Amino acid sequence: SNPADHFRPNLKALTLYAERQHYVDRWLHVKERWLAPWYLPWWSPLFQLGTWYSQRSRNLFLVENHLSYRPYKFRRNDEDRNNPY
Amino acid sequence: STVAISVQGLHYVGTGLAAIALAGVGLGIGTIFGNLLVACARQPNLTKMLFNYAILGFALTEAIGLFALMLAFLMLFS
Amino acid sequence: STVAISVQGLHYVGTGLAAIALAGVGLGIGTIFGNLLVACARQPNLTKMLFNYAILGFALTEAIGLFALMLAFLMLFS
Amino acid sequence: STVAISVQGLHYVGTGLAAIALAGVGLGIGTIFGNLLVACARQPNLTKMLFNYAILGFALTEAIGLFALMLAFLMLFS
Amino acid sequence: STVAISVQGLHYVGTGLAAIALAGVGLGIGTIFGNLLVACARQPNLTKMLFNYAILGFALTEAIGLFALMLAFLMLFS
Amino acid sequence: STVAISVQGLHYVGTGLAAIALAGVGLGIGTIFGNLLVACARQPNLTKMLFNYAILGFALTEAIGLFALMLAFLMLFS
Amino acid sequence: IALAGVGLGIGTIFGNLLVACARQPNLTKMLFNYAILGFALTEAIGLFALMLAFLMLFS
Amino acid sequence: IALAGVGLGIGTIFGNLLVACARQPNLTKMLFNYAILGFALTEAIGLFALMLAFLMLFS
Amino acid sequence: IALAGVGLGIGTIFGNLLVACARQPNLTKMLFNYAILGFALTEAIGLFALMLAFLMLFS
Amino acid sequence: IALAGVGLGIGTIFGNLLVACARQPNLTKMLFNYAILGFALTEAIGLFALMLAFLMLFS
Amino acid sequence: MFLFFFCDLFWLRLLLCMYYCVWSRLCFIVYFNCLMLIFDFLLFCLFDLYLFVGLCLFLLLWFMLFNLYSLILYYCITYLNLYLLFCIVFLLYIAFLFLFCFLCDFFLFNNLLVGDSFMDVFFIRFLLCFLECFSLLCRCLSTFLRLFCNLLSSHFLLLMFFDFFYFIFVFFFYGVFCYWFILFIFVFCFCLLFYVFLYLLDLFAAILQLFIFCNMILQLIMDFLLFLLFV
Amino acid sequence: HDLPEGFEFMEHKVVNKDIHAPHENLETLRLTLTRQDEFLLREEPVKCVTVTGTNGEYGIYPGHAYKIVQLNPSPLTVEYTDGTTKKYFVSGGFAHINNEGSCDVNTVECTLLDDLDLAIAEKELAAQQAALGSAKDDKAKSVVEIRISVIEAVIAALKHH
């Protein structure tokens, strides 16, 4: 155990936490702000690049109908194999 | 009934098994040098070159033995 | 009666057994280099070409040991 | 009396035993390439054909290794 | 239920396994000397350079045997 | 719960394993003498120097055997 | 099991002996003596293992 | 299991016997005697393992 | 497991036989007889191993 | 596990067969027939091991 | 989760800035074979076979700054993680593979179908092609696994031996003044010999493993190179 | 102006057996024992021939595989199908064995073992051993040792029978 502990980075300085929802929402706000102006038509390749793949992924998530249960990505405890909740 | 048991002494057994891997490594190293002697007597002009390749093979063969020896230490010290 | 038992030191045994596979890999490597040394003395002009093939075998021989080494970790750390 | 016991940790031993089968595959590959080097020195004009046959032999041995790993992974998980 | 068990005599088992690692080491050393005799008989003038390389191979092979022996004695006193 | 168990028949098992290493030594002896005869036939003039080197190989191989044998007897009486 | 190597080791000596004798039939006596020497040395280890087996059998 | 190292050792002797015979076949009558001698020693080792296999199987 | 040594030993004898026969085909008859002799000996050891198996499986 | 000593023995026979065919390429038929004989004998040993394996498996 | 940390090369970066503000020749390279792919004259390749030189040199420099200096006690291999090495090897290997595939020359893969027309196509050649396609990815995985495991095992062994040496040196040196001084002297000499041997072995093995790491990539590249002859 | 090659005037060529051919059971080996461009025996059918090459002794019977042997100073035996043994002594050369059933043993010198004298051989060994003691340099000693090896082989060859 102790010898195994010698293989860690030795210059850790700071750790920051952020919820997926929050920064995803902020990114969406930024994307809307930059893609909103009239001088960027919806048919431009840039706008489609920005929007279409995200729309496709979200639609795929919504359409999903799985017989099994997928535990919440951001639980408080995900180390117990016998407690998905 | 649900019973959970934790045997401490098993780590010794796993450690001894890994040591068996050294039998192949130790034998493999001897194989290289045996060929080296039988090769130097067939072409002594290259003895220095052959000696270099033999040492290279020894390290590669030895490197594997260390992998097993690491696992021995991991279990012997946990 | 239905009895469930969980022995918590058995993964040491499985790890050691997988480590034993490294003896064959070590021996095979020694065999390759033994053949290399005895083969270079026969056709020295092609020494370099033989060396490249020798390393190729090592690449295709060390990889197998990694699978066994991989299983060791999958059981040693679980 | 009728007693039923279910040990959860015995799949580690089975996985380790299956992993031992790789020692033969590793040694067999070493034998293939050891002879390849000797053969190339003997008749270097046929290096490509010998290399092709050696690869074929390695593939068959690797296929056996895959079967052994399949059993190892199955027992490890199942 | 949580049950902790400590088996004493297991260290004897692990130590014996490490002793088996000396089988290949002993065999490997014998292989080197056997090859040495042939090389000397086929090239009698090189009775010293071959002898030196044989000693070098023995030392490396002896080292591997000593790595296992350290675990063999260590577990016996653990 | 903390349970301490002392098995008094496992000092036999470790002893038997330590004896297995003798096979790797005994076989090593035959290899040296297996090739000594060939060397003598190849170069009968060196029937003496080859014999001395073979004795050196046998003694060194036997040294490994006795190192293993020491562990065998220690666990037999302890 | 220690006898497995000892028995095999003897076969190796008596295998090469035939090749050596066929190559140099004039030296059968000297080769034969060395083969006996090797057999005795291997047998010594065989008795060591045999001694341990019997001790653990009647103990 | 010790028999594995005995039966294999026997095969090794005979394998070398064929080569020795196929090298100089006029010495077959001499090599064959030596080959039997080797079989007489390795087989003797197998008896010791067989003895233990019987003592423990009937005790 | 003892059959592993017997099976390998039998293959070893025949392996040398092919080399010996190719070297001197004129002696195939004599070599073949000796090869069978070796098989008759290695298989005999196998009988003991099987006998022990049948003497413990049916016990 | 006994099959391990069987498959290896079979590989030994064929490995020597190729060399024998290379040394004496006109004697392929006799070598091929003898190799088949060795395979049958070795395979018979493996079948005996399989017999015990199935007997215990269904017992 | 966002962790801010630093590599352990800042002093080495300072030394590089100090000693390489002026030009200097380079004549010794760990993997020289990336510069000489063609050995028979009049053979030339239309593919950018020399594209790997810069990456090879940079990787050698980076891994040598890390691994070789790791022998110094307490020096940290900041990148020593299995999946990080996997990402590195994935980048390199898959980049070259996609460079070959984007070429849109399907005939380039004809050699995957091993054997000749004599062999049964479905039961032999197709299986061999499957195995070789698998073997490419296995080669990638093996490269990264080998690089990881060599370092891990070497440093574990070094740490354990150093701990044992410290223990015996500190708590058993008084035996020099005692009647059993000879045993301690023998043990100390053996430990010194082992120390030297381990350091030499690790020094050699690091460079050798870098050589092999680069050689696997170069072999991938060479497996799909075709050389034209000048006329 | 093209000149004939000196082998065109030789009408006894070497017959090689095609690899893709059936085997034949042969009871006779056609031996050609030659010394200094002179055949002592010519395509003679014999039962077997024993030759002492560098690695060891070879007993060649009909059908022996293709091989080339570098002889050493030693006796050579020829046993006929009748049951008669003829023993020569050679100082060196080569022996070519063909799978077709032929053996061409070309020697620098091939003398019947009867011609050699053991008394002359014995006293020569004593003289050469004295010469080796007085040998000036390493080369001279090596040459003297070559003579002794041949002499001892001759002495041992005659003492055998």
Ligand SMILES: CCCCCCCCCCCCCCCCCC(=O)OC[C@H](COP(=O)([O-])OCC(O)COP(=O)([O-])OC[C@@H](COC(=O)CCCCCCCCCCCCCCCCC)OC(=O)CCCCCCCCCCCCCCCCC)OC(=O)CCCCCCCCCCCCCCCCC
């Ligand atoms: C809230 C708290 C604060 C933190 C906020 C953070 C916000 C985060 C937002 C979310 C981010 C999410 C994702 C994070 C992923 C992180 C991954 C990671 O860490 O990977 C490891 C990985 C480690 O890489 P590495 O191999 O160690 O090499 C990177 C090194 O930087 C070395 O690489 P290099 O050497 O190759 O780099 C080139 C280098 C080439 O070399 C140099 O240039 C040499 C200098 C190197 C400087 C950089 C090294 C820093 C060393 C440690 C700090 C130094 C001391 C600081 C003192 C602070 C005191 C409180 O040049 C530079 O660095 C250029 C900058 C030079 C600045 C010089 C300034 C001079 C000012 C002079 C003023 C004079 C005034 C006079 C007035 C007089 C009046 C009379 O990190 C990176 O690769 C970089 C990660 C950065 C991600 C972006 C983060 C967002 C930006 C944050 C800026 C905050 C500024 C405000 C701070 C105020 C004080 C509190």
Ligand SMILES: CCCCCCCCCCCCCCCCCC(=O)OC[C@H](COP(=O)([O-])OCC[N+](C)(C)C)OC(=O)CCCCCCCCCCCCCCCCC
């Ligand atoms: C190309 C091959 C290069 C070979 C280099 C060979 C170097 C030989 C060094 C001999 C011994 C040196 C001893 C130094 C002692 C320092 C003080 C001390 O206490 O150290 C103890 C330390 C550790 O000793 P320790 O383990 O006894 O420490 C005990 C301390 N306690 C008890 C607290 C744990 O010494 C070392 O770690 C030295 C190991 C050196 C290994 C070789 C490293 C080579 C790679 C780095 C080269 C860097 C070159 C950079 C050049 C510029 C580049 C641009």
